């Protein structure tokens, strides 16, 4: 994957609304800002139940956004990242629906998970009872194959059944995927909800070792036709690094809420310990198209014991500190869990969630652009975007708060402010100087200080973090402090939103 910033978007909510507006604005708003783009599912439909997740036909674009020739003229300029998703598809489906009505006489009856595929013996209740579950209650769902009952396999929404990635008739289908996408220059294939797309009797069903066959499996027949491969999973910090020496690339989940903590309570030590440790071969992001995940750096939720990267105490302090931050915003979007070690996600702008504090905000950004990984900016965060209220009490969906439609004008109205203008800047300094194409190196304090320093063949840069020195979120003095050397010599800014950086 290029070590460029990308951005992620929805094709409809960056501009008129099309695939070619969308471009429009990556090519003449934010050249040499954004080098590549995650364009969220723009399949039929993408205006769905979950925002273009619940496709019924992964295979064709949505006419309302543009054609898959659109994507192609995208990929001249942008290397393009996309989501195929593996592991279920509509009830809705042509597929599917034939099962329904010819049962085991469809030729895609094969294609599709029931109780009986993966428990031809029983189950017992531990074996049920140990399938790890993104959803309350058992992965099952009775629909009628011809007229008898059946219980197929649903992860998340009886909307959604999982397809047997073992079956030649699930190959098939997931590789007319994957041969769209690569027709159309796609680069890289984020694979939604791949963790659950290998069932077996016994197991969580969750990143067992069938999985990660399955996964190389996707992988070796992604590089065939072009493509290359990340997955997406939330877990346990320690799972994470075991899952990430496994696989090609992952998300670095603990890093958005370790620096949220950081900002608010001046602790380093958190964020070097995760320096540390954490998987390089990672995209970086701050927000995300869904919620500020907090389960990245609590405890591992089967077994509380397990202690996170701050204490269960500082996982609670940061829900709460979104919630104040926000003046009770997030509070109006997040579903309450009687307690906040249960919930998974906080349902903010991140920009909000730092209470719209600039100097906080460029700061948070300018660690992840120095983390080894690939990074991402999500078009609200793009723009410094608030949370949007109007739109969240119209739709009542929680991460709507998160999701704003912002017009070609209101892109323009919001390149014109300080905060926008230094992440712009700051993008294109992480893609031009060739210092973070080289070697990664840190030191640290103890708790007040961490210096992130990147060492290339023309070129050099040190990062030093100090979240102690503007606790507050109407603080106005800068936290992060840079120094580099390129053409010009060295330079210097201890204010990265008035005198933002810019390479020879």
């Given at each position: 994957?290029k070590?460029?910033?990308?951005?992620?978007?929805?094709?409809?909510?960056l501009?008129?609304?099309?695939?070619?507006?969308?471009?429009?604005?990556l090519?003449?708003?934010?050249d040499?800002?954004?080098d590549?783009?995650?364009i969220?599912?723009?399949?039929?439909?993408?205006?769905?139940a979950?925002?273009?997740?619940?496709?019924?036909?992964?295979?064709?674009?949505?006419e309302r956004?543009?054609?898959?020739?659109?994507?192609?003229e995208?990929?001249?300029?942008?290397?393009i990242?996309?989501?195929?998703?593996?592991?279920?598809?509509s009830?809705?489906?042509k597929?599917?629906q034939?099962?329904l009505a010819?049962g085991?006489?469809?030729?895609?009856?094969?294609?599709?998970?029931?109780?009986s595929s993966?428990?031809?013996?029983?189950?017992?209740?531990?074996?049920?009872?140990?399938?790890?579950?993104?959803?309350?209650?058992?992965?099952?769902?009775?629909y009628?194959f011809?007229?008898?009952?059946?219980?197929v396999?649903v992860?998340?929404?009886?909307?959604?059944?999982?397809?047997?990635?073992?079956?030649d008739?699930?190959?098939?289908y997931?590789m007319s995927?994957?041969?769209?996408?690569?027709?159309?220059?796609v680069?890289?294939?984020?694979?939604?909800?791949?963790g659950?797309?290998?069932?077996?009797?016994?197991?969580?069903?969750?990143?067992?070792?069938?999985?990660?066959?399955l996964?190389?499996?996707?992988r070796e027949?992604?590089v065939?036709?072009?493509?290359?491969?990340?997955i997406e999973?939330?877990?346990?910090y320690?799972?994470?690094?075991?899952?990430?020496?496994?696989?090609?690339?992952?998300?670095?989940?603990?890093?958005?809420?370790?620096?949220?903590?950081a900002?608010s309570?001046?602790?380093?030590?958190?964020?070097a310990?995760?320096?540390?440790?954490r998987?390089?071969?990672?995209?970086?992001?701050?927000?995300?198209?869904?919620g500020?995940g907090?389960?990245?750096?609590?405890?591992?939720?089967?077994?509380r014991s397990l202690?996170?990267?701050?204490?269960?105490e500082?996982?609670?302090?940061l829900v709460?500190?979104?919630?104040?931050?926000?003046?009770g915003?997030?509070?109006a979007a997040t579903?309450?869990?009687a307690?906040?070690?249960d919930?998974?996600?906080?349902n903010?702008?991140?920009?909000s969630?730092?209470?719209?504090?600039d100097?906080?905000?460029?700061?948070?950004?300018?660690?992840?652009?120095f983390?080894?990984?690939?990074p991402?900016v999500?078009?609200?965060?793009?723009?410094?975007?608030?949370?949007?209220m109007?739109?969240?009490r119209?739709?009542?969906?929680?991460?709507?708060?998160?999701r704003?439609?912002?017009?070609?004008?209101?892109?323009?109205?919001?390149?014109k402010?300080p905060?926008?203008?230094?992440?712009?800047?700051?993008a294109?300094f992480?893609?031009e100087?060739?210092?973070?194409?080289?070697?990664?190196?840190?030191?640290?304090?103890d708790?007040?200080?961490?210096?992130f320093?990147?060492?290339?063949e023309?070129?050099q840069?040190?990062?030093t973090?100090e979240?102690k020195?503007?606790?507050?979120?109407?603080?106005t003095?800068?936290?992060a402090?840079?120094?580099?050397?390129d053409?010009?010599?060295?330079?210097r800014?201890?204010?990265?939103?008035?005198?933002?950086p810019?390479?020879?």
């Open positions: 994957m070590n460029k910033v990308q951005l992620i978007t929805y094709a409809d909510r501009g008129d609304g099309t695939i070619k507006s969308m471009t429009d604005i090519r003449t708003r934010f040499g800002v954004y590549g783009v995650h969220l599912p723009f399949f039929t439909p993408f205006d769905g979950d925002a273009g997740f619940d496709p019924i036909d992964h295979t064709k674009v949505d956004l543009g054609s898959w020739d659109d994507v192609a995208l990929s001249k300029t942008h290397n990242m996309v989501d195929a998703i593996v592991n279920h598809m009830w809705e489906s597929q599917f034939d099962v010819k085991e006489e469809s030729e895609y009856y094969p294609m599709f998970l029931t109780m993966v428990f031809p013996n029983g189950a017992t209740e531990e074996d049920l009872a140990g399938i790890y579950r993104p959803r309350p209650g058992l992965p099952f769902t009775h009628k011809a007229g008898k009952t059946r219980l396999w992860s998340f929404t009886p909307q959604q059944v999982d397809i047997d990635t073992d079956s008739k699930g190959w098939e997931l995927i994957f041969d769209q996408m690569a027709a159309s220059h680069s890289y294939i984020r694979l939604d909800a791949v659950y797309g290998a069932k077996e009797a016994g197991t969580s069903c969750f990143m067992t070792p069938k999985t990660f066959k996964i190389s499996r996707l027949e992604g065939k036709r072009g493509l290359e491969i990340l999973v939330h877990s346990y320690k799972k994470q690094v075991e899952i990430a020496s496994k696989v090609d690339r992952v998300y670095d989940f603990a890093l958005p809420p370790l620096l949220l903590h900002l309570t001046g602790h380093v030590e958190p964020v310990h995760w320096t540390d440790i998987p390089n071969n990672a995209v970086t992001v701050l927000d995300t198209h869904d500020i907090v389960i990245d750096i609590g405890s591992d939720q089967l077994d202690k996170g990267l701050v204490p269960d500082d996982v609670d302090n709460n500190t979104i919630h104040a931050n926000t003046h915003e997030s509070q579903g309450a869990a307690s906040n070690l919930l998974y996600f906080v903010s702008t991140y920009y969630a730092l209470g719209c504090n100097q906080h905000y460029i700061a948070a950004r300018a660690v992840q652009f983390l080894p990984g690939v991402q999500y078009y609200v965060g793009a723009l410094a975007g608030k949370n949007d109007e739109l969240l119209k739709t009542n969906n929680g991460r709507d708060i998160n704003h439609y912002y017009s070609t004008a209101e892109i323009d109205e919001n390149l402010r905060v926008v203008k230094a992440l712009n800047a700051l294109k992480r893609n100087l060739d210092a973070f194409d080289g070697t990664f190196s840190y030191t640290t304090d708790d007040t200080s961490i210096s320093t990147w060492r290339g023309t070129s840069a040190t990062l973090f979240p020195r503007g606790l507050g979120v109407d603080n003095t800068p936290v402090m840079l120094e580099w050397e053409s010009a010599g060295d330079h800014s201890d204010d990265l939103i008035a005198n933002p810019v390479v020879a």
